Write a protein that binds this ligand. Sequence first.
Ligand code: GQ3
Length: 209
Amino acid sequence: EVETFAFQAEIAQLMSLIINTFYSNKEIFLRELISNSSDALDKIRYESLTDPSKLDSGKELHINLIPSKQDRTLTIVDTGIGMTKADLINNLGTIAKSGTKAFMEALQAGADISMIGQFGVGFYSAYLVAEKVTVITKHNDDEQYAWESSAGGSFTVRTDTGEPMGRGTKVILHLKEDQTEYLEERRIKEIVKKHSQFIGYPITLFVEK
Ligand SMILES: CC(C)(C)C1=NO[C@@H](Cn2cnc3c(Cl)nc(N)nc32)C1
């Protein structure tokens, strides 16, 4: 079964702003997703210090960047703590409502879209470059889920039938047709070096076959 949900009005407004505002500096999406992965890796590492069994689903703590020219996707994979069903449907959106309102006000007060991560809603910068985002995620003691949205005010959640991940999150960016530069090894290297060079987990940039 696929369940369809309405975004909170403030998050739908944020997504429309990101999709519709003219802003050439689109590359900031990657730093935001890598930062989210780093935060999730921090969380499972910290929890493992008092409950080592939390790493039974995988001890490797890393970030993979995987381009696919054939699928026109850029995938950001981490082995962090992952998200529960309640995270996906309700609880992360509840936290994001406050940051969205703060971001939207700062925007009017002269802030830049690149400051989005300071408001805890950096994920939605993915819609600078993606027409659709699919998020596959697995938290210990919950099932593997697929979250998906092409914006337009709704998202879906379903139990994922694909390959099991163990633990963590995969953000699959279905790139807009004019945003395929973010499949180039060279371009991704440039962005990671510029924005993400001090992240405390190995970032592997996969090469296309
Ligand atoms: C609900 C949805 C749109 C999918 C997000 N809201 O929060 C986002 C940022 N975020 C929160 N928890 C995260 C974990 Cl555990 N990992 C990673 N990579 N990102 C995480 C994602």
